Design an enzyme around this catalytic site. Structure first.
Site, PDB file in Angstrom:
ATOM      1  N   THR A 158       0.809  -1.217   0.000  1.00 23.52           N
ATOM      2  CA  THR A 158       0.000   0.000   0.000  1.00 23.52           C
ATOM      3  C   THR A 158       0.845   1.272   0.000  1.00 23.52           C
ATOM      4  O   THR A 158       0.325   2.356   0.264  1.00 23.52           O
ATOM      5  CB  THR A 158      -0.979   0.009   1.184  1.00 23.52           C
ATOM      6  OG1 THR A 158      -0.272   0.018   2.434  1.00 23.52           O
ATOM      7  CG2 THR A 158      -1.886  -1.208   1.139  1.00 23.52           C
ATOM      8  N   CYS A 159       2.136   1.174  -0.315  1.00 28.68           N
ATOM      9  CA  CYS A 159       3.037   2.325  -0.218  1.00 28.68           C
ATOM     10  C   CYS A 159       4.180   2.088  -1.203  1.00 28.68           C
ATOM     11  O   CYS A 159       5.081   1.296  -0.920  1.00 28.68           O
ATOM     12  CB  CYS A 159       3.549   2.483   1.209  1.00 28.68           C
ATOM     13  SG  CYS A 159       4.569   3.927   1.496  1.00 28.68           S
TER      14      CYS A 159
END
Ligand SMILES: [Ca+2]
Ligand SMILES: [Ca+2]
Ligand SMILES: [Mg+2]
Ligand SMILES: [Mg+2]
Ligand SMILES: [Mg+2]
Ligand SMILES: [Mg+2]
Lengths: 339, 339, 339, 339
Positions: free
Chosen positions: D251-252
């Protein structure tokens, strides 16, 4: 990690000057045999090093003291022309990796102006690189500075062509050497004398109004500015609060900080210190700092391992590493220029 | 806010040298009339300023170029003795506020050694302050440096008395002035030439082994170290990785960082920059930095308002402001020394 | 290649807590098997690392969350006693390489004080290390803070024995974890949550007068001070110019800079940044900064290669690397202590 | 004496909320009567301050906690609409001195997006300013964060209109206030709690992929980035070398330094520290730093006297003082914009 870096304090020597190259290497190199090969090589060893360390483009220039050591004006001019013709042919082999600065005899402002013009208009050279003052006089004991009105024709040519001038050091010679340096000779070169010469010359240009008459002129200093950023506060104070009330304002119309924002650039050549780089970002600004190496007096590995791995925000690593120079020298594409 | 600060680059001039004082003031002061009164005053105006700005103790020294301008050795020696006798009587008025550095003729190592000894043993002077090289030769065109074996007897006296030596600048003179400075004269003094002289001399002492033969010797530089901390990385690199493999190690046994940890001190005179102070704390260390002013070329207000209000941790503000100097000069109590 | 370094945020775990150890490792390690071996080893792997990286002495402490995770007071106290007896036996094998911090249940001030005292008097432990607040209450969703009058007997025991207290972080738990962290769980630990807890607790000690009632008390924070130095200016401004005119002065008698000069230490654990170290040298002072690693969450290589090769003056490298801690912990000798 | 500066953390309150205004002032002001007058004034006192301190343009926003304190969604939305209509009428009197940020209820992503859009399209507002999480739930003890997929429609509206979002702090409330802050209440606000909330929220946006889904989104933090630059090294290390090998990479997708180069801005509000500014220039880059004041919680005098007189290179003084914000907010002209 960063690719497409630009280096622009990168020296070469003519193959026919091996003796001069070895003498200079006896002062400034710990491996003369490797140094001889590296300073004469252009298109093989230099590229291997650059391929290993994320350097896309190098602007080459003639080794110090170079033409500035030559006090016979006829010999000096002929050597400058020879060197420029030589390096133009060498960089044509890999123009996507190499450009060049003009090498000049600085005995005569108009002569130097014409040769700079030839280099830019004929060969597409990126500017001029000169090793501080020009030796002159019957036995080379005199020195020619460029911070006066006789040189206006030359600085007007730099601004007309819109190309920068890199003020590189040279060794002390003659009476200056004997009086100040012979008895402490290990300070000659990078440890101290180089910076003393360049800072004197560039601050002479400041205080004698060169950047007032030629506000477009761009001057570059190596070695993180040859001490000047350390005394930015002190110079500014002793100008604005002292000498500017005593007569300096007659030939110097802006502050030292103005000239660093508008006219002067510093490079990281030979000064691979993040602490000092950070201090220069405060005193000068990341927008006015260029990566450079000082090969072959410094290694690609030392300079590029330092810079690639330095703790630095990503904005300034891109600017110092290549984007500042890409704009200043109006560069077309080159290897990894947008990587 | 801080009281009991110690300043030690604080100049005076003899009342009988008003013409010399005015000439020097024409270069370095914007109010000659006030300057004349302040540089000659010891016990009235100087105290008013110090009372207003939290300065408890000042170590006074003779104005530049002082005795180092005097190339006749007999005249120079007599002037040094005269000045030391004079200032000893002046500081006796307020010994809780003032000490003094010895003023020396540096024509002869033994002569200077004996006069330093007289000053310390008879008057309790705190050390010596010398304005760079001693002018010498029939018309003063020669210069005497102290970074050689002839001066071992003098440096042995400094370490025997265990007192420091403050290497202050002086102006360029003679052929050096004509060749490098006359055509860019606004750079003479604080803007550039001062630092060039002191840094050359002190780094000459380093590279010629003075601190190896005299490892206890303490040398002080003003103006945050006369550029040297800016090139700490570059000097160290070009010593340890270059010149030390070419012959420098024969007369230089430690690193430049070792000498700054063991032998060299810097002061804040004339360099009221927190950004540069912070950089010097990294390159040199707060333990080796002393507050100073450079009065009357700088004002108490400028120096003390800066330092009193600078963003700084409390540990280092106390050390730089007074505790470093209290230890180095073995000071007894003085006004606000423990406030 | 500095030898004799001291590290003091260096964790171990009991072999019998393997499941708990593997859970913590699942959050904060990329190699669980090596982590389990390293955090349980005292005298082999840990010594080998220290031998290769110039660490002479390590003060060992219990892993987080440790006893502060245990909300049953009887179980917590028995575990603390077990841990202290255990580590005392293990460090006897290498008394010139290891000391220990006391592990404490912090449910009860007198109980904690008595166990700290037993550790110091019986075993020569060097102080206490506690992982922020003590979990308490029926299901451990309550927190016990130490910044209040109930803990005066404990702080007085620290100053009587004259040993410091290391405020180490722990994970957020219970309702706080659910409300603030669960939806951004990758910030738990070193990225953010750790510093938020420790800075809250230590600045609570400041503003609730703990250092006023116990002016000799020494508190240590890891990770270059858990953000606090970044806000030194802002905290000081909002204390002295705001809150201390609204009531804070009733329980907080000195400035935040005073408390960092007199009571608070920071270490370099898990923060191998020369740029940030330099900034802390400005805001906190090199005298109040200690080297540490945070092993085995960080490697010896990362911490020691960074520090050994960081650009730093020699004075502060020696102080931060060992001499500050040597004085604070009254170490008369250990391996390579004067190297 | 730089003119034309831009400030953009500058608060106002509705006159009808005097009781609420006086409560906030009881925590954060030393002069409640002046505070009430200043925070409600738009066009007289505020203009006089800006005229005396070289501030050409101010982007005004609603005081904290503002709409984020209102947990009834209908009341919150009506208040936001009222505030935006109100400030739009007030800044029409001085369009060359004032712009405004949208005030929003953040209970519902589509509702907030529609109101931001109305503000920008109808009134030419410059973006949004929101005081951290939205209070929600029966008695306001719940918090709404924006770092999740529900808010994609809102972040997409920001990038479509191409305006930034200022993540301003608010006070801790409810159970969090009771559990962490009530027993150390002097840390509430600028001393600590403010930064803890904003850094949590913005680093939540980072690690939950908001800047990956909305790569053009610009987020602004006050107070030199709410501690985050201090831990740039540590965060980056614990992301790239730890958490991104355990699941964060899902998610990053970029580094924390990337997000500070591409998405995040910091301002100088309430943090008038040149030492800390320099450090942020290193860790964040001068291109991503904006001048701001935090009026009326801070004075124009403190902020502008600090910045106007800070030691800084000229390039970065112009960028931070106005040129960065001029480009970000697409300002073609305002009072003294090119001074
Ligand atoms: Ca097992
Ligand atoms: Ca009223
Ligand atoms: Mg070079
Ligand atoms: Mg002086
Ligand atoms: Mg730890
Ligand atoms: Mg605000």
């Amino acid at each position: 990690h960063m690719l497409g870096k630009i280096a622009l304090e990168e020296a070469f020597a003519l193959p026919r000057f091996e003796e001069k190259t070895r003498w200079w290497a006896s002062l400034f190199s710990t491996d003369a045999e490797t140094h001889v090969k590296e300073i004469t090589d252009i298109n093989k060893i230099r590229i291997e090093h650059a391929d290993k360390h994320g350097v896309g483009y190098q602007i080459l220039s003639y080794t110090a003291p170079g033409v500035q050591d030559i006090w016979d004006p006829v010999e000096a001019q002929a050597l400058a022309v020879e060197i420029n013709d030589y390096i133009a042919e060498q960089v044509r082999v890999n123009p996507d990796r190499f450009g060049a600065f003009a090498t000049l005899s600085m005995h005569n402002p108009k002569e130097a102006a014409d040769e700079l013009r030839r280099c830019v208009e004929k060969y597409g050279f990126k500017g001029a690189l000169v090793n501080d003052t020009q030796r002159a006089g019957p036995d080379g004991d005199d020195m020619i500075f460029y911070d006066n009105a006789d040189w206006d024709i030359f600085w007007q040519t730099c601004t007309e062509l819109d190309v920068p001038f890199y003020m590189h050091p040279r060794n002390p010679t003659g009476t200056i050497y004997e009086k100040l340096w012979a008895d402490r000779k290990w300070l000659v070169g990078p440890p101290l004398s180089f910076a003393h010469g360049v800072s004197l010359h560039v601050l002479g240009m400041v205080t004698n109004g060169v950047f007032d008459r030629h506000p477009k002129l761009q001057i570059i200093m190596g070695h993180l500015g040859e001490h000047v950023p350390f005394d930015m506060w002190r110079i500014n104070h002793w100008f604005e609060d002292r000498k500017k009330l005593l007569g300096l304002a007659e030939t110097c119309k802006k502050t030292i900080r103005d000239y660093f924002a508008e006219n002067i650039w510093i490079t990281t050549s030979g000064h691979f210190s993040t602490t000092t780089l950070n201090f220069c970002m405060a005193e000068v600004g990341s927008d006015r700092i260029l990566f450079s190496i000082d090969y072959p007096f410094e290694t690609f590995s030392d300079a590029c391992e330092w810079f690639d791995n330095a703790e630095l925000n990503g904005t300034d690593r891109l600017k110092i590493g290549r984007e500042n120079a890409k704009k200043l020298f109006k560069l077309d594409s080159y290897k990894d220029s947008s990587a």
